[PDB]
Write a protein that binds this ligand. Structure first.
Ligand code: FES
Ligand SMILES: [Mg+2]
Ligand SMILES: [Mg+2]
Ligand SMILES: [Mg+2]
Length: 156
């Protein structure tokens, strides 16, 4: 189904939504240092949000660009970073924030990913970082700028 299609470069990032019209994520809405938001990709011409496929679930956060690791900054936009939100341990959505680590926490078994430093696993059983999603800003809206930088979710 269109709603289960994979994320594609050029897709518009929208806030995770129930029904109703989607809301694109605008750069100016994200305050550097604030907790991440959960997002999905939306096909820019059909406006179909690809939220029926869990492996399209994203977390999106903004930091001061100087606080990002250079490798992360390569794929960031005005300090905004995005990653897959599917835990690489057993696939739970990495839905919680760790304020004093600026990290994403998985409530299932306590995986913690260090968002400014490439979602390095700093606690729990995730075997590898959630992959980064390159982003760019177009007319103030966040857009996927490439494929995920590695496989999503639970792998061999
Ligand atoms: S599914 Fe995330 S830590 Fe186990
Ligand atoms: Mg605002
Ligand atoms: Mg650092
Ligand atoms: Mg625990």
């Amino acid at each position: 189904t269109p709603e289960k299609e994979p994320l594609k470069p050029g897709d518009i990032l929208v806030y995770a939504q129930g029904g109703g019209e989607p809301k694109p994520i605008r750069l100016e809405e994200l305050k550097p240092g604030d907790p991440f938001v959960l997002a999905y990709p939306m096909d820019p011409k059909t406006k179909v949000v690809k939220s029926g496929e869990a492996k399209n679930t994203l977390l999106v956060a903004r930091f001061d660009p100087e606080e990002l690791a250079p490798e992360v900054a390569q794929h960031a936009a005005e300090g905004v970073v995005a990653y897959s939100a599917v835990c690489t341990h057993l696939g739970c959505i990495v839905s919680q924030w760790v304020a004093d680590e600026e990290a994403a926490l998985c409530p299932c078994h306590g995986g913690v990913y260090d968002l400014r430093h490439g979602a390095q696993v700093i606690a729990g059983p995730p075997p590898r970082p959630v992959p980064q999603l390159p982003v760019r800003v177009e007319d103030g809206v966040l857009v996927a700028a490439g494929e995920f930088l590695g496989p999503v979710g639970v792998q061999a």
